[PDB]
Structure 1
Amino acid sequence: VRTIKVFTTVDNINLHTQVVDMSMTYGQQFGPTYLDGADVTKIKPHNSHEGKTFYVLPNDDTLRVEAFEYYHTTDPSFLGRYMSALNHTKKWKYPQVNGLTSIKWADNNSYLATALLTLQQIELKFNPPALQDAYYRARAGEAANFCALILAYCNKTVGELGDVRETMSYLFQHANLDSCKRVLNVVCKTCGQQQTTLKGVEAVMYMGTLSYEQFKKGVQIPCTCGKQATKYLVQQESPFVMMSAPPAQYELKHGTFTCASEYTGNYQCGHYKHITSKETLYCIDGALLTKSSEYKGPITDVFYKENSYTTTI
């Protein structure tokens, strides 16, 4: 019996001593087994494999509990979807652009680069340690794992067309936004006034206008009675807000926003770029950078800083 030693793990923190028979495939001894993203289930052991760390699908209670504690999911497909993505994201380039980790364009990844650039500019703590650890590594320039996890958590495959607002929404559901509170007043001529409090993700995202200012002053929404009604922001408690709308020509002014998603072309199959407000306006298109003092173009998301806001209406 000829038998190299390996480490199996689900989280790459808790490592388990295994000794594998070299005649038998990984699959027959561990179930599904990955190396650096690459499915090696059906492959048998090489000599250059001795000592390395393989991810396995959890097949005992120890590993199921370690997988939940690391990823915050029991979904049995999660590991395989993460590894399939990693197999591509490890080949992407992550250039520093204007002090931010970006992604050189590949595999329809503009939405992922736009999301990654945005997450380096807003205050967020991820609940799953997997995501938090990968986020720190991405901020320091090694973003392959983090991008693979974003795809796995969003149920997206490499190449699939993605929406930055939907991606941010899924990521926010995996983050600690409990202290986040939004109070709205709705004013109708007939039913009158009703206030509602939103918490968590719904406290930081709005779909309908790009202007935080315009949200504060009020926006026109259909009333359940039949009238048009006015919805306006009463109180906001969050470190940022995300304002979204269908793409339309919009003017971005230096110093009045943190960053924004530019979207050009048809529904679904267009291209995102990222506008960030520094000492001037920078436009990050993957590996490409341009700057200008002014900007007008097709914007679909604008991010703004917040801490505590109460209206004077």
Structure 2
Amino acid sequence: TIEVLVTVDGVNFRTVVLNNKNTYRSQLGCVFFNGADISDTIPDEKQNGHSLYLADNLTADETKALKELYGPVDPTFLHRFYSLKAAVHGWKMVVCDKVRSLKLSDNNCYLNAVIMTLDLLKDIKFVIPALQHAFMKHKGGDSTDFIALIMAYGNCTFGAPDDASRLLHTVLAKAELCCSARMVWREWCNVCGIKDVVLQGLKACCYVGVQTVEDLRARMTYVCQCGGERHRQLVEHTTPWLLLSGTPNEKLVTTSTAPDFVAFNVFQGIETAVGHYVHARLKGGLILKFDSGTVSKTSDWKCKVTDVLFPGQKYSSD
């Protein structure tokens, strides 16, 4: 018989004794030793002195610590995170032209688009400790934990291609601004009346449905609660940066009089099959195409853009 440790946060442990007549799964549950799923083996000796990592069948105190560390999560979040964290150990962050990027492997080009876009967002942090922990860790040269986390939260499967925008906004939904930003919408209906709506924080910096600032400021039209025509228009907006996102749209990106945006992401291929993501920025007077480990620095591109990042905002409707 052996005696091992059990943790879920890497801080609080509990001593557990398991018999060699039944496996970990039937005695203790899903566990990871040295970054490997040993939850179907028989207790040995090198683990009879070190610690494990539980994933299911937690205690009331562990579940408590889980919520403090990981926030409200899926019942399988722990298992998937351990599995992914081990799987993405082989990945590496290169330094393509004074910018870092995720090297292409196991269909992770979509993750490259997300991270490289995240790295361009000023003054942001995360509510969830583990996420913020892994984030600051990422800023310093090791990004294994952070990558595995955002894959875990976005329910990304290792090796499978996925949506960059979808993951980016799922991540930002768990982030907050370390500064201030406001967004004022004027809604009006000829029957019900004029109503101003104010948005403040990170939510004021992101919008899905448009890709040009002009379209964001254009009068929008939808249905009021009464059934009649309702309208909406941005009349005040101040942010450190503006992230616009929409369906892949084929634009003629030219650096001849470079447009307002600083960076943008591109979806290549057909959107019904499996395509390819390329992160692009604007350095100097030329375009920089970052292809998950590569740096093409041509000055013109006819491509299908997805996410478009703009600088700080300052707008009033006169």
TM-score tier by shorter-chain length is: 0.7 to 0.9
Normalised to the residue count of structure 1, the TM-score between the two structures is 0.84
Size of the aligned set, in residue pairs, is 308
CA shift for structure 1 position 106: 2.3
Whether 2:280 is the aligned partner of 1:275: answer yes
CA shift for structure 1 position 249: 2.4
2: distance between equivalents of 1:66 and 1:134? 17
1:127 match:
127
Alignment map for 1:1-313 (pairs within 5 Å):
1=1, 3=2, 6-18=4-16, 25-57=23-55, 59-123=58-122, 124-177=124-177, 180-186=181-187, 194-199=195-200, 202-216=203-217, 218-222=218-222, 224=224, 229=231, 231-250=232-251, 251=253, 253=255, 254=258, 256-267=260-271, 269-279=274-284, 280-306=286-312, 309-313=314-318
Contact 2:30-2:39 at 8 Å conserved across structures: yes
Q: Which moved more, 1:264-273 or 1:18-27?
A: 18-27
Q: Which moved more, 1:265-274 or 1:249-258?
A: 249-258
Contact 2:33-2:52 at 8 Å conserved across structures: yes
Contact 1:169-1:201 at 8 Å conserved across structures: no
Q: Which amino acid aligns with 1:257?
A: F
CA shift for structure 1 position 56: 0.6
Q: Which amino acid aligns with 2:269?
A: G
Q: Which amino acid aligns with 1:245?
A: G
1: distance between equivalents of 2:203 and 2:306? 18
Contact 1:263-1:271 at 8 Å conserved across structures: yes
2: distance between equivalents of 1:284 and 1:36? 34
Mark the runs of 5 or more structure 2 residues left unpaired by the alignment: none
Normalised to the residue count of structure 2, the TM-score between the two structures is 0.83
CA shift for structure 1 position 263: 0.7
Q: Which moved more, 1:234-243 or 1:47-56?
A: 47-56
Change (3 A) 1:27 1:281: same
Contact 2:94-2:100 at 8 Å conserved across structures: yes
Q: Which amino acid aligns with 2:148?
A: A
Q: Which amino acid aligns with 1:138?
A: H
2: distance between equivalents of 1:64 and 1:228? 46
SS in 2 for 1:274: strand
1: distance between equivalents of 2:254 and 2:204? 23
1: distance between equivalents of 2:202 and 2:101? 25
CA shift for structure 1 position 187: 6.4
Cα deviation, 1:55-110, whole Å, max 9, x if unaligned, reads 11352122111111110025321101112222321122322223444222223222
1: distance between equivalents of 2:307 and 2:70? 28
Contact 2:183-2:200 at 8 Å conserved across structures: yes
Contact 2:91-2:102 at 8 Å conserved across structures: yes
SS in 2 for 1:292: coil
Contact 1:257-1:302 at 8 Å conserved across structures: yes
2: distance between equivalents of 1:188 and 1:210? 26
